[PDB]
Symmetry: C5
Subunit: 273 residues, 5 copies
Amino acid sequence: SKIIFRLLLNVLMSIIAIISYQWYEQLGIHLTVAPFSLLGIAIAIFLGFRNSASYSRFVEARNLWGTVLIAERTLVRQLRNILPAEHDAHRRIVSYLVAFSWSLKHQLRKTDPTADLRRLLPEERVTEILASSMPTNRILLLAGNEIGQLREAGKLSDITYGLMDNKLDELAHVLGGCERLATTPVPFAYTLILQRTVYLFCTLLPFALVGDLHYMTPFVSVFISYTFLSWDSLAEELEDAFGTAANDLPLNAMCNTIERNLLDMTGQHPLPE
Amino acid sequence: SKIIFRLLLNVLMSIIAIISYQWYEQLGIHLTVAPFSLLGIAIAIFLGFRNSASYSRFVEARNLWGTVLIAERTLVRQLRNILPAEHDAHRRIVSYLVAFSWSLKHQLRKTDPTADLRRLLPEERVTEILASSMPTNRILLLAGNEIGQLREAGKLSDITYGLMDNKLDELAHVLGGCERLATTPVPFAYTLILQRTVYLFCTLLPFALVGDLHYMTPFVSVFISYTFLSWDSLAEELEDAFGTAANDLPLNAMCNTIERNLLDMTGQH
Amino acid sequence: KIIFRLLLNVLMSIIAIISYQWYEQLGIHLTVAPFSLLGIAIAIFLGFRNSASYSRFVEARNLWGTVLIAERTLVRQLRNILPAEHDAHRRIVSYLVAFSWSLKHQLRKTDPTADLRRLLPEERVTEILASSMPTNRILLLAGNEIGQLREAGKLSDITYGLMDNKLDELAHVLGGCERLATTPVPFAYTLILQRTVYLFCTLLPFALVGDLHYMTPFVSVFISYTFLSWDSLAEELEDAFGTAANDLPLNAMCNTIERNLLDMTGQHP
Amino acid sequence: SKIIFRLLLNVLMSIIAIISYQWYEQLGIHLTVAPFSLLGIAIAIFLGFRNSASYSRFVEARNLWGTVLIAERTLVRQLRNILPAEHDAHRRIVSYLVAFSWSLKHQLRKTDPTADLRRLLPEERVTEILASSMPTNRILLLAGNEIGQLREAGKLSDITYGLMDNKLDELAHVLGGCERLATTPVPFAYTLILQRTVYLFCTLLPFALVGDLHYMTPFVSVFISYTFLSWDSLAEELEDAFGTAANDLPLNAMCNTIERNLLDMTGQ
Amino acid sequence: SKIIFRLLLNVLMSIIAIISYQWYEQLGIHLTVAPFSLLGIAIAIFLGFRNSASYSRFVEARNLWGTVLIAERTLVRQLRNILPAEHDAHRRIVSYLVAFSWSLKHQLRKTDPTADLRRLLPEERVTEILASSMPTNRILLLAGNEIGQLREAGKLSDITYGLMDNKLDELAHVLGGCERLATTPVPFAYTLILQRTVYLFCTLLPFALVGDLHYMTPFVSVFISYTFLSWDSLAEELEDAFGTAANDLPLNAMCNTIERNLLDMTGQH
Ligand SMILES: [Cl-]
Ligand SMILES: [Cl-]
Ligand SMILES: [Cl-]
Ligand SMILES: [Cl-]
Ligand SMILES: [Cl-]
Ligand SMILES: [Cl-]
Ligand SMILES: [Cl-]
Ligand SMILES: [Cl-]
Ligand SMILES: [Cl-]
Ligand SMILES: [Cl-]
Ligand SMILES: [Zn+2]
Ligand SMILES: [Zn+2]
Ligand SMILES: [Zn+2]
Ligand SMILES: [Zn+2]
Ligand SMILES: [Zn+2]
Ligand SMILES: [Zn+2]
Ligand SMILES: [Zn+2]
Ligand SMILES: [Zn+2]
Ligand SMILES: [Zn+2]
Ligand SMILES: [Zn+2]
Ligand SMILES: [Zn+2]
Ligand SMILES: [Zn+2]
Ligand SMILES: [Zn+2]
Ligand SMILES: [Zn+2]
């Protein structure tokens, strides 16, 4: 945590305010609580509204990765109920849906997806995915091909295809939502204005409190600084949700759960009497 | 009250603040209202936003369990309307749908679902559901198999199947919603950090209010503490509705309400 | 209703005026600054409470709005697809009107027998009252009317599906309305704030008397009026469907629904 | 602009507080800023939440009238794409949909739609619509008749009818939405509490401020009054959210845009 | 940023406050921190609510532009799945959809769209687009005609047409949503009330702050003037997300992303 260094600096800023208190009126400088109370309340309001915006983006990030689990379950679930005999079709579609989860993971984590794609799909398909400028959207097209080919075979009617097509439409809203959160953040000015005001408020606070507290200055100033800094750092963990930090989503575990889910519903060996 | 231990501790610290006030001039330590007022208003704003997020989680929690009630009612309604003669199918689907509700209750609470599943389903399926790592999802698959088998027999058309399949999707959106809302740790320790900030503000407050109130310190300081601690403990309850430390009554009720409703529709009681 | 405490607030202020000459005699200090910090905190918590209460009232009004929308569109679809089947029209409308009235009685926790016998044959009223939830039975009986027209050959599976969607939407309303009635916003919400504001407003003139002297009862009743009126509005918005001053006129709403559905069929009330 | 008359009243109430300040010690009355700070902050919190609720109902009114534009554009678009030859059908439905837009406007504004209805529709239909107690709903039923009769002619299938029916369902949600906003206003308590409080706070404010500010009282008190009254008046206009005021929705401009769009798509 | 000018002018106003403080009791002028504190907190609350509503407009504008990508991705995807042989049909529809994004961008910015329309579509169609009052809605009708004529031949059934029809309905919701934000912004009172109040508070702030701070008056007044004006400017920027400012949407880059998505490898699959 980088918060603890700021707390140690707040103690140092408090002690230098205590010893230099003699040279205050000799220069003619005064700092009271009431002007800093107005500034602090203003900052406490603005931080609250920013953290609300940061939480709302984190909820949206959590919701979209929840939908990957829902849409892929229901698509395999529909496949098992409508076409219970097409087991060769199942394992092809399943492998694409697992691959979609892993490729979406690596797209948000800015990492190479080649290892996971080769683990799940044949080399003719991995080359096709990597050729595309948008690799994860290619997978949905290739998964869409498999549902389309079953409709082309006559195994799926236009109604049963339409029921399965809507699940792929849900999956497209996941990818488009995840890309939108990754590319467009909370406008940088939000974090730039507040982080500047908080740090400058926390350092100038013991100088404003030294006249009222005298010797209790380091104990109180830290306790006020801690409240304003913890709330500021809370938003700095929620805004970026697709990284590898403490509050950031465990996407490795989530993709493992999806892989476990889709190989739980399938994998049941057909025709053992 | 649960927090009444900390309320009497606040009065205990107030009496300490009165007697030790004589020693304050020996080190040159002073505590005015204005520094603790700025901190107090700041905490009050931060508790307001946190409680709003806690309420937001609670409303969505009840909405999902409302959809369990809605989707299962409308699935049984569609079965009676489209296929009025197929009572053998009715009994099986209702058995699975109620088994979905109870298994979801035991999944959110992390409790054993074996006793409830054995009551509603035969042992061939109970072992199959318990073998799966996702038991509630397995029930939806088996419920989907019942709708799917009526389609393959020729009794359900592709459109009438589609109407019933959408109701199974609603329950699957709930399961995925409930799984997400229970297994998310939205803070690292900030649910405890903000709780600790309230605690230490409450205990240091009588030392700050002793100069302005003297003997009225235990009266006013406990009344400020009460308003802050009650609002903090309220957000603690609303954040985890599907908790082991949370009330079991609203979750056990809606599982019985759905069982009572589905048995009434088919005409069994 | 709030005037009973507004007169009590002036009476408590009179006590604060006469006892001010005994303040330093008893040895008590009460400054404005600690009560300012507490009062701002309460104002924040009431601000979030009233906002949460407003969202309940909006959702409750929206659900009853959807009854009027869904039933209009169901009759509209019946007239466009099957213009000849007026025997179907009159039966379904009488069910949809009965659903609205039984929804009113369910939320109010009252007997619906007086309104059900007015609209429906006696055998159906006995069947409706037999069920655990009367409204869910009506939607099932209205669904059977659409279902029997599908079995006759007059409605295809597609045209059944369009009419079925509105019956699904009405069941989402029923599940929504039941949720807002059966699950109130947790116990503590009113237990904290209502009693906190009462104890704040009565103990405030004791703190105000040091700075205001004889203007104490005039300014204390000002702050009390603003705090209590915001408190009372939030309780009127939370609850709900009943017979309070600021609540939904459900008797007038059900009459508007009945008049709309009779007007579309070519009938006069 | 009710504010400018009230701002001059506040300066006039401030000068009373200055001249009667010599009488304060005689009556035994002392007024500090600190209790009025507590009250004013509370008012500012409650005004902030009310204005938030008022803006939310304005956005909802904007979104519903946005849906009028979208659902009617798409229904005409669906008609041209499925049935490119049936122009006799187009002329009636477009005129019905435009009549829906104007009838919804006149129902919300509480004005007579007779002049607009006879401008678009034949006398056999206008007299039938005006006969109905819900004239905007009557248009949706007659618009549904045109889609329904195209289905019964064998020109529209059950599938293509269902795609068009969803748009009529979407416009019916708007009608029920707009009626909900009109018949049920923002609880009159919100206006009864705050407006009484804001006016009484601003009037009583210089009497507490005169003890600390003296001759700067009419400058400071009028600037606090301006902030509190401007925010209250803004929330008042957003609460409606319709009507004839300048701050409200330009519904005449919107209905003409809908009328122009549907006549553009048909080539008229 | 125009704040840097108003920040430097705020320091100059603070120098006037320092030199004139001696003459305060001579001129008969008293200015304390407490009334300006009450005013400043009130402004900070109203700025907090405005900035939140401003951000909500920015989010909804981004969400609609996100939908442009998603709805067009799937519309081409469905064409690449249902009709994989119709390659000449693909390139015609794709070109309309790329033209839809660019024509939307130029409509919201109020600039000439002819330069980008010629780049993507034939001259017989570009003139038909420019002839219409709403050029972006005309493109949806022209792209819809391509889907409609494939149904006319019998290549698409009524069901598979409906799947593609829903996607063009989704794009029309973006068109109406983006117009709603652009044609009418926030009420003009919102901007004119706050921008008058914020700076007139900031200029009159050092005159009230001089009594407590003396020589530190320009340091603290520029701090508060920074925090209040930076929040007002951010709110003013985000309200018009379709403008050409720093915190606004990069709509030029977004349309290039849509173009590269729909033309994945010159329209191949
Ligand atoms: Cl398989
Ligand atoms: Cl049965
Ligand atoms: Cl509807
Ligand atoms: Cl009829
Ligand atoms: Cl639409
Ligand atoms: Cl025409
Ligand atoms: Cl035409
Ligand atoms: Cl889509
Ligand atoms: Cl191509
Ligand atoms: Cl000086
Ligand atoms: Zn299989
Ligand atoms: Zn979509
Ligand atoms: Zn049965
Ligand atoms: Zn789904
Ligand atoms: Zn004493
Ligand atoms: Zn509807
Ligand atoms: Zn009839
Ligand atoms: Zn449903
Ligand atoms: Zn035409
Ligand atoms: Zn003709
Ligand atoms: Zn007339
Ligand atoms: Zn192609
Ligand atoms: Zn639509
Ligand atoms: Zn000086």
